[PDB]
Design a protein around this ligand. Structure first.
Ligand SMILES: [Mg+2]
Ligand SMILES: [Mg+2]
Ligand SMILES: [Mg+2]
Ligand SMILES: [Mg+2]
Ligand SMILES: [Mg+2]
Ligand SMILES: [Mg+2]
Ligand SMILES: [Mg+2]
Ligand SMILES: [Mg+2]
Ligand SMILES: [Mg+2]
Ligand SMILES: [Mg+2]
Ligand SMILES: [Mg+2]
Ligand SMILES: [Mg+2]
Ligand SMILES: [Mg+2]
Ligand SMILES: [Mg+2]
Ligand SMILES: [Mg+2]
Ligand SMILES: [Mg+2]
Ligand SMILES: [Mg+2]
Ligand SMILES: [Mg+2]
Ligand SMILES: [Mg+2]
Ligand SMILES: [Mg+2]
Ligand SMILES: [Mg+2]
Ligand SMILES: [Mg+2]
Ligand SMILES: [Mg+2]
Ligand SMILES: [Mg+2]
Ligand SMILES: [Mg+2]
Ligand SMILES: [Mg+2]
Ligand SMILES: [Mg+2]
Ligand SMILES: [Mg+2]
Ligand SMILES: [Mg+2]
Ligand SMILES: [Zn+2]
Lengths: 206, 155, 80, 24, 60, 98, 127
RNA sequence: GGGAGCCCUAGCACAGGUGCUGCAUGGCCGUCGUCAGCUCGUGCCGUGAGGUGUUGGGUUAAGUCCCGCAACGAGCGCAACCCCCGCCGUUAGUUGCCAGCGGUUCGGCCGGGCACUCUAACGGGACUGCCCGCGAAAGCGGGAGGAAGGAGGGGACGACGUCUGGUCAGCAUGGCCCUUACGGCCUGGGCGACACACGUGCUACAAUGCCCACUACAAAGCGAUGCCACCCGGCAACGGGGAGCUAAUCGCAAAAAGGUGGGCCCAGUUCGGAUUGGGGUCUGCAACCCGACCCCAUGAAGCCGGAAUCGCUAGUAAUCGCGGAUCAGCCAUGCC
């Protein structure tokens, strides 16, 4: 049972909405759908850049997609011939003229979505889970951070009986709103099932 | 009440006799939150206590409550055997409640059709010593001093 | 206490079929799946086979049962 | 009371209006 | 649900009363809040991911 | 006498851009009728917490639209010229009548 | 010229205006008794004036918005009690211990899910 | 003659499966339990599993704080940070008014002003801070001042774990399985079947009541191929006409118990509205199976319920109406 989404809980304060636009009760439904299509075409094609998040904003018909990736190299390409292809491939699903931006991630080891995303990929490359997690945490703790915590789900190691592996140090104060705890979930499509990687990263206070 | 001894609430005095007992009665007469026509009863009852008796109603209501208050009652007890009906004293707080409750209940047994009347006659009859309320009081105290043998469990 | 306003309803593929067989003789049996259709006076005669989710039925058609709906005569469920 | 269709109380309970609870 | 059973895609449904909803995200046919076009389960997921702008944990 | 009903899903961003619409003057050019409060409309959705059963779970979500009014009396043309490219909020919208 | 207090009670708001006068209270363009016709609790709206000796030494133009008449009674009561203190700050002595200055913050409790009614819990079997 | 595109058979790579497996999984949920608990680092003890800390004495809603001590600290929990309610202020005047004067087609309708109510952003406000008594301290009892006083009221929030708990039919997803049917489309039927039994409810059995008429006070919500003022026809559901409202401005909308008047007079009744016969309305291609509503007639059982058994400690239970979601319509008395 237990434990609400540490994002959706803090959504009020310490964390703001991924897509932040306004729409009436005859539009909201449509903008939302297309907004989703963008995230889908984005999370698939930009995997290599490792996209932490995608901010989307709207106004006088136009749409300001502000992609946050660790390596903006892979979204630019031939000095452009990639950020053009993708601002183009968005122009088809969105008939409304898009504007793709790219945001550097100073510290991939301070964005929970990426940390988790990291762990996920190892588990498919059959890394040792226990270490992966203790390591992943350290890489996050070494990069500043007031605290951090990772969680791998079940079937660690092909093991017939699903388990759960842990690791976490510093403070990770879940019930305090005044927190800022980036959360990130990564899936791990292994040969013998699926695994879930949850990553918590505490930082700052007020 | 596991923690604190739990205090009694202080009902604001009557609007017409400026009394606390009369609010209490009115509250026991009331059902389903309809306090307006519970008072609309007790007072209608009060007009009737005069146009059937030279006495002032407050003095009579008070007079009859006293005749229904039980000095003794039993409450059961589980021992190293079974149920023993231990004769207890009855606190002045509990005599209040018991009297009033008994008065309304007795009143609503009556065959008179208007509510005010039933209250009226019960309130009267009880002052003058008789009436169903008093009977389930002279009764109650009769079970005490009958289980007198079990007085030695005074709690 | 039912419902046919200023419309009245009879599913028409069955109707153009029965009125057609009122230019001459009465076709023994008509295979319908539309129990939906009210009975018109022009149906009094030819035995219609109302379906059932399982079987067309020999519903002979008296004049004593005009205003009624077809499916009122082909019981659906089976009981004891 | 609330069960009888042809009354005040009853028509109020079942959303409706009619002969027994005029709309106005 | 059944991928086949998105003949909700059937733009003409023959009669407008065969028109139904379905979650535009998961296919769910049974709690599809029409404002969002999403089913109840998808709504809570998207709400928590903060991809429903303006939508928030509500308490009073 | 121009009419401007402002509304969005966030109110930190409203009152900080309705304020930026009252940049004609504080009260020295056209009258200015102050940023008008004007009640917010709250839609609510109530979702059963898990998939499959557990009726008694439930979790509340709301989406609230906040609405402002402002309204300026006697529109000098330079006051209007300022209604051009002078904005920053993205989640704020703008009805205009006269 | 007059004297004023607000006084709210459980989703109801009175506004109390105190004129010097004969004791005529009017509530919402209507007589005081025409408005609380046959509600025994009514007389208790004027329990401040009764207990500072003012029952007939003031007229009172009172506007009342919201809720239900019995809360409007309690809210007028607070309204009066407040006006009568900004008319003579000394009145508190024979007014505060009675309680008339306090505002009754007792308000309807929210409906909780999985309950029937905030606290009324659904009935269960087999245990 | 050869060919880009979309249409085309007859083959192949594949689709598709709400078929199996929570007895392989993720995710999300339930549950003990919003219970006050679960641990960790380092030291110390013990051959060792382990222990100490976290035991003791006070105290708290609380491993809450205090005092003590081979322990000194720390993390997840508690509390606080967020929200709604209660008092007050500043900003703000196409909602609000015998506040104050002018006009009245006696409606805040008009001029007119925002004081007040409100609306909704930002702030103040509480701290055992002040006094008296017990206390080694934490705190306890009481008393002032205050709208509120020791957690002011209600939310959101659920620890390490437990249940090999629920869910592969929401969604993923390993494996196994079917592949002119375990896929796909129709039309009709079913999910609504009735000798029976249980759960959760609704409506009752009436006089603190029921009926009719008049009249008074809400909050929260929803409204465009929508809410429907008002007018006309109909006993009525509703049909015809039609105003306003992208709604603090128009509408749903009547709040209902309440209050005043009248009727019923202890009766299975002017209690109760089940059943059934008839005549209609509206929604939908379509209401037989199986819609809701209106009207006429019918007027069942039920006189407060065995053994047993549920909820609730305050604006609570009890009681009264109102709204939304889903949704053409509606079986809603359910739920929020
Ligand atoms: Mg044909
Ligand atoms: Mg009746
Ligand atoms: Mg599928
Ligand atoms: Mg449908
Ligand atoms: Mg819960
Ligand atoms: Mg209530
Ligand atoms: Mg070609
Ligand atoms: Mg396959
Ligand atoms: Mg599971
Ligand atoms: Mg607790
Ligand atoms: Mg030893
Ligand atoms: Mg050793
Ligand atoms: Mg110990
Ligand atoms: Mg101790
Ligand atoms: Mg602690
Ligand atoms: Mg807490
Ligand atoms: Mg104020
Ligand atoms: Mg005048
Ligand atoms: Mg002290
Ligand atoms: Mg099972
Ligand atoms: Mg069923
Ligand atoms: Mg059962
Ligand atoms: Mg008419
Ligand atoms: Mg009468
Ligand atoms: Mg009973
Ligand atoms: Mg309790
Ligand atoms: Mg009831
Ligand atoms: Mg509906
Ligand atoms: Mg309802
Ligand atoms: Zn869905």
């Amino acid at each position: 049972g237990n434990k609400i989404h540490p994002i959706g809980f803090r959504l009020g304060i310490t964390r703001d909405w991924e897509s932040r636009w306004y729409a009436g009760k005859k539009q909201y439904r449509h903008l939302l759908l297309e907004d989703q299509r963008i995230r889908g075409l984005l999370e698939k094609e930009l995997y290599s850049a490792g996209l932490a998040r995608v901010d989307i904003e709207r106004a006088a018909d136009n749409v300001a997609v502000t992609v946050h990736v660790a390596k903006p190299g892979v979204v630019i390409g031939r000095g452009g011939e990639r950020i053009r292809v993708l601002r183009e491939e968005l122009a088809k699903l969105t008939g409304k003229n898009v504007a793709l931006n790219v945001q550097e991630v100073q510290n991939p080891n301070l964005s929970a979505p990426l940390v988790a995303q990291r762990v996920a990929e190892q588990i498919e490359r059959r890394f040792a889970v226990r270490r992966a997690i203790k390591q992943a945490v350290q890489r996050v703790m070494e990069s500043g951070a007031k605290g951090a915590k990772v969680i791998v789900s079940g079937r660690i190691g092909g093991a017939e009986q699903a388990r759960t592996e842990w690791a976490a140090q510093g403070r990770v104060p879940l019930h305090t709103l005044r927190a800022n705890i980036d959360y990130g979930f990564a899936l791990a499509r292994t040969t013998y099932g699926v695994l879930g990687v949850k990553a918590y990263i505490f930082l700052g206070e007020v | 009440a596991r923690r604190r001894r739990a205090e009694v609430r202080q009902l604001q005095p009557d609007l017409v006799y400026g009394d606390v007992l009369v609010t209490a009665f009115i509250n026991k007469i009331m059902r389903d939150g309809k306090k307006n026509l519970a008072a609309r009863i007790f007072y209608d009852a009060c007009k009737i206590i005069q146009e059937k008796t030279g006495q002032e109603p407050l003095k009579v209501f008070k007079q009859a409550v006293e005749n229904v208050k039980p000095r003794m009652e039993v409450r059961s007890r589980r021992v190293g055997g079974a149920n023993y009906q231990v004769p207890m004293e009855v606190s002045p707080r509990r005599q209040q409640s018991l009297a009033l409750r008994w008065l309304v209940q007795a009143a609503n047994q009556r065959p008179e059709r208007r509510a005010a009347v039933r209250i009226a006659h019960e309130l009267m009859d009880a002052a003058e010593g008789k009436g169903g309320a008093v009977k389930k009081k002279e009764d109650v105290e009769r079970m005490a001093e009958a289980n007198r043998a079990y007085a030695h469990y005074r709690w | 206490p039912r419902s046919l306003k200023k419309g009245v309803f009879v599913d028409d593929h069955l109707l153009e079929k029965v009125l057609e067989l009122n230019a001459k003789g009465e076709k023994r049996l008509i295979k319908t799946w539309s129990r939906r259709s009210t009975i018109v006076p022009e149906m009094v005669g030819h035995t219609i086979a109302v379906y059932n989710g399982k079987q067309h039925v020999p519903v002979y058609i008296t004049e004593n049962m005009v205003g009624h709906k077809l499916g009122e005569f082909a019981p659906t469920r089976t009981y004891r | 009371g609330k069960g009888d269709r042809r009354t005040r109380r009853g028509k109020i309970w079942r959303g409706t209006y009619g002969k027994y609870r005029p709309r106005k | 649900a059944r991928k086949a059973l998105i003949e909700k895609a059937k733009r003409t449904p023959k009669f407008k009363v065969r028109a139904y909803t379905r979650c535009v995200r998961c296919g769910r046919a049974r709690s599809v809040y029409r404002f969002f076009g999403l089913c109840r389960i998808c709504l809570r997921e998207l709400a928590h991911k903060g991809q429903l702008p303006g939508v928030r944990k509500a308490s009073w | 006498k121009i009419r401007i009903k402002l509304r969005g899903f966030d109110h930190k961003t409203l009152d900080a851009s309705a304020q930026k619409i009252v940049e004609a003057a504080r009260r020295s050019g056209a009258q200015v009728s102050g940023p008008i409060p004007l009640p917010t409309r709250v839609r609510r959705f109530t979702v059963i917490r898990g998939p499959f059963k557990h009726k008694d779970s439930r979790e509340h979500f709301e989406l609230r639209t906040h609405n402002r009014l402002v309204d300026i009396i006697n529109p000098n043309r330079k006051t209007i010229e300022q209604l051009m490219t002078l904005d920053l909020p993205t989640g704020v919208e703008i009805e205009i009548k006269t | 010229e007059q004297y004023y207090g607000t006084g709210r009670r459980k989703e109801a708001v009175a506004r109390v205006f105190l004129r010097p006068g004969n004791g005529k209270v009017t509530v919402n363009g209507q007589d005081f008794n025409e408005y609380f016709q046959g509600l025994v609790r009514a007389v208790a709206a004027l329990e401040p004036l009764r207990a500072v000796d003012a029952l007939g030494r003031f007229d009172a133009y009172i506007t009342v918005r919201g809720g239900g008449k019995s809360g409007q009674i309690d809210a007028i009561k607070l309204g009066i009690a407040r006006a009568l203190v900004q008319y003579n700050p000394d009145y508190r002595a024979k007014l505060k211990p009675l309680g008339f200055l306090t505002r009754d913050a007792r308000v309807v409790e929210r409906k909780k899910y999985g309950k029937h009614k905030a606290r009324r819990a659904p009935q269960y079997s087999k245990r």
